[PDB]
Write an enzyme that holds these catalytic residues in place. Structure first.
Site, PDB file in Angstrom:
ATOM      1  N   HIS A  83      41.131  50.125   6.246  1.00  0.00           N
ATOM      2  CA  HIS A  83      39.794  49.741   6.621  1.00  0.00           C
ATOM      3  C   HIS A  83      39.857  48.475   7.467  1.00  0.00           C
ATOM      4  O   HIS A  83      40.716  47.589   7.163  1.00  0.00           O
ATOM      5  CB  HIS A  83      38.885  49.373   5.424  1.00  0.00           C
ATOM      6  CG  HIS A  83      38.708  50.459   4.386  1.00  0.00           C
ATOM      7  ND1 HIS A  83      39.669  50.753   3.468  1.00  0.00           N
ATOM      8  CD2 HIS A  83      37.719  51.393   4.229  1.00  0.00           C
ATOM      9  CE1 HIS A  83      39.248  51.768   2.732  1.00  0.00           C
ATOM     10  NE2 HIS A  83      38.068  52.176   3.172  1.00  0.00           N
ATOM     11  N   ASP A  95      40.364  45.447   5.245  1.00  0.00           N
ATOM     12  CA  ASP A  95      41.639  45.308   4.588  1.00  0.00           C
ATOM     13  C   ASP A  95      42.632  44.557   5.456  1.00  0.00           C
ATOM     14  O   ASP A  95      43.483  43.817   4.956  1.00  0.00           O
ATOM     15  CB  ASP A  95      42.308  46.681   4.364  1.00  0.00           C
ATOM     16  CG  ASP A  95      41.565  47.636   3.466  1.00  0.00           C
ATOM     17  OD1 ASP A  95      40.835  47.189   2.560  1.00  0.00           O
ATOM     18  OD2 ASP A  95      41.703  48.848   3.725  1.00  0.00           O
ATOM     19  N   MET A 148      45.673  56.738  10.991  1.00  0.00           N
ATOM     20  CA  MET A 148      44.251  56.839  10.631  1.00  0.00           C
ATOM     21  C   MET A 148      43.771  55.439  10.306  1.00  0.00           C
ATOM     22  O   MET A 148      44.482  54.598   9.783  1.00  0.00           O
ATOM     23  CB  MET A 148      44.104  57.806   9.428  1.00  0.00           C
ATOM     24  CG  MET A 148      42.661  57.988   8.929  1.00  0.00           C
ATOM     25  SD  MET A 148      42.064  56.729   7.783  1.00  0.00           S
ATOM     26  CE  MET A 148      42.689  57.376   6.237  1.00  0.00           C
ATOM     27  N   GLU A 159      39.432  64.855  -0.217  1.00  0.00           N
ATOM     28  CA  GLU A 159      40.250  64.148  -1.184  1.00  0.00           C
ATOM     29  C   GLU A 159      40.322  64.959  -2.454  1.00  0.00           C
ATOM     30  O   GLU A 159      39.267  65.359  -3.011  1.00  0.00           O
ATOM     31  CB  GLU A 159      39.680  62.739  -1.497  1.00  0.00           C
ATOM     32  CG  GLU A 159      40.486  61.988  -2.514  1.00  0.00           C
ATOM     33  CD  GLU A 159      40.020  60.570  -2.779  1.00  0.00           C
ATOM     34  OE1 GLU A 159      39.843  59.820  -1.799  1.00  0.00           O
ATOM     35  OE2 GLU A 159      39.772  60.283  -3.966  1.00  0.00           O
ATOM     36  N   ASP A 195      43.445  63.519   1.947  1.00  0.00           N
ATOM     37  CA  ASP A 195      43.740  62.510   0.971  1.00  0.00           C
ATOM     38  C   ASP A 195      44.239  63.124  -0.306  1.00  0.00           C
ATOM     39  O   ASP A 195      43.561  63.981  -0.939  1.00  0.00           O
ATOM     40  CB  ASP A 195      42.472  61.661   0.645  1.00  0.00           C
ATOM     41  CG  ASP A 195      42.074  60.651   1.645  1.00  0.00           C
ATOM     42  OD1 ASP A 195      42.736  60.439   2.670  1.00  0.00           O
ATOM     43  OD2 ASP A 195      40.982  60.044   1.391  1.00  0.00           O
ATOM     44  N   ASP A 204      45.421  58.465  -0.982  1.00  0.00           N
ATOM     45  CA  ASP A 204      44.280  57.581  -1.298  1.00  0.00           C
ATOM     46  C   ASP A 204      44.271  57.434  -2.780  1.00  0.00           C
ATOM     47  O   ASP A 204      43.588  58.147  -3.503  1.00  0.00           O
ATOM     48  CB  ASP A 204      42.976  58.109  -0.742  1.00  0.00           C
ATOM     49  CG  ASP A 204      41.856  57.124  -0.829  1.00  0.00           C
ATOM     50  OD1 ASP A 204      42.048  56.023  -1.357  1.00  0.00           O
ATOM     51  OD2 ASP A 204      40.758  57.448  -0.307  1.00  0.00           O
TER      52      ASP A 204
HETATM   53 CA   LIG Z   1      39.901  59.205   0.000  1.00  0.00          CA
HETATM   54 MN   LIG Z   2      38.724  58.629  -4.724  1.00  0.00          MN
END
Ligand SMILES: [Ca+2]
Ligand SMILES: [Mn+2]
Length: 387
Positions: free
Chosen positions: A53, A56, A87, A216, A244, A286
């Site tokens: 991000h 981050d 990404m 995800e 993810d 993730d």
């Molecule tokens: Ca995720």
């Molecule tokens: Mn999650």
């Protein structure tokens, strides 16, 4: 021994191994990591790359000279190691301004701010090499029914995505977007809650080709859905731009366990699907090492993500190559599923008495599908009782 190498395309968010362990009920259990240390440590474990991000990589509110130093140091660590950045994404959830959303905040000024914050980071992501820009609309939604007119919110969501598509087009960027669905948490219900809802929304965007999904594991499982099935639907639609990987035990808060934990058989069937479909994107984790762990345990958990993918890949490959499995698949008519129902066409079907008027339904009904024998071969392969 299941050692990762860069061709495996394993990637990690800075916020994964960097999670300090704060939870609803708990203070941090670990010190913050410098992103450069994470890049180094992940490279040594055999990772292919990292993701971030905005906030981050560059602390929120950084000056221009602080921003430059954070980026220079990071780019440097990447250039040194050969680690990629496939990404990136925007933090549209932490700061209190986003308490009712970014793109679908009721306050128009917040929606405009969200878009500007996203566009700034798209430029950086492109510079650093990202092929996918993820959107996780974690604040988009509601706790109560009157707070959010969903049709108006979807209008706002579409406007936002369309503007981002206009932006990347105007710059000639090759980057594409991926929506990461989640059904709830931190909002009581989140908009676009599943792979299906995100796929459907994308069809109404002005330039649908620029958008896919970033499903995800744990998120679909928070709705009790079958993650492999949803990935197959995404593949079918040509929209699996990124994925993810993590673990989740069932319908509850989002756990983000290491991949392989939670629903192990679902992990097996997922790896089988990705490999046999020839998915070529990142295998991104993730995840969050549990807050019980110290840094040694962080790295062990990260290594375990990759290890479990590789074990499962071996088992799935052995399953699919086993002549006894190939015979079982035929016995269960998986091959017939691949044939058109009516390549002869509608008129021929309508005029085919053998298909209906004269079809022996009882003989068809009596034929067992042999799915249990097939599934026990799959179990035996997963457990290493075969292969
Ligand atoms: Ca995720
Ligand atoms: Mn999650």
């Amino acid at each position: 021994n299941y050692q990762p190498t860069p061709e495996d395309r394993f990637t990690f968010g800075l916020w994964t191994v960097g999670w300090q362990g704060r939870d609803p009920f708990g203070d941090a259990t670990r010190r913050a990591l410098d992103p450069v240390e994470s890049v180094r440590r992940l490279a040594e474990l055999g990772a292919h790359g990292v993701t971030f991000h905005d906030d981050d990589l560059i602390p929120f509110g950084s000056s221009d000279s602080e921003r430059e130093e954070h980026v220079k140091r990071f780019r440097q660590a990447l250039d040194d190691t050969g680690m990629k950045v496939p990404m990136a994404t925007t933090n549209l959830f932490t700061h209190p301004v986003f308490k009712d959303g970014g793109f679908t905040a009721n306050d128009r000024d917040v929606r405009r701010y969200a878009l500007r914050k996203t566009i700034r980071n798209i430029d950086l992501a492109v510079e650093l090499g990202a092929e996918t820009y993820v959107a996780w609309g974690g604040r988009e939604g509601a706790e109560s029914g009157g707070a959010k007119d969903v049709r108006d919110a979807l209008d706002r969501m579409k406007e936002a995505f369309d503007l981002l598509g206009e932006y990347v087009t105007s710059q000639g960027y090759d980057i594409r977007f991926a929506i990461e669905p989640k059904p709830n948490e931190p909002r009581g219900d989140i908009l676009l809650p599943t792979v299906g809802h995100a796929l459907a929304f994308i069809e109404r965007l002005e330039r649908p080709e620029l958008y896919g999904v970033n499903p995800e594991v744990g998120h679909e499982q928070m709705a009790g859905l079958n993650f492999p099935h949803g990935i197959a639907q995404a593949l079918w639609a040509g929209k699996l731009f990124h994925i993810d990987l993590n673990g989740q035990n069932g319908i509850k808060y989002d756990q983000d366990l290491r991949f392989g934990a939670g629903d192990l058989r679902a992990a097996f069937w997922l790896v089988d699907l990705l490999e046999s479909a020839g998915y070529s994107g990142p295998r991104h984790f993730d995840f969050k090492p549990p807050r019980t762990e110290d840094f040694d345990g962080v790295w062990a958990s990260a290594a375990g993500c990759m290890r479990n993918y590789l074990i499962l890949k071996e088992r799935a490959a052995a399953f699919r190559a086993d002549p006894e499995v190939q015979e079982a698949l035929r016995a269960s008519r998986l091959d017939e599923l691949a044939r058109p129902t009516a390549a002869d066409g509608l008129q021929a079907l309508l005029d085919d008495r053998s298909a209906f008027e004269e079809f022996d339904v009882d003989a068809a009904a009596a034929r067992g599908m042999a799915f249990e024998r097939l599934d026990q071969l799959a179990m035996d392969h997963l457990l290493g009782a075969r292969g």
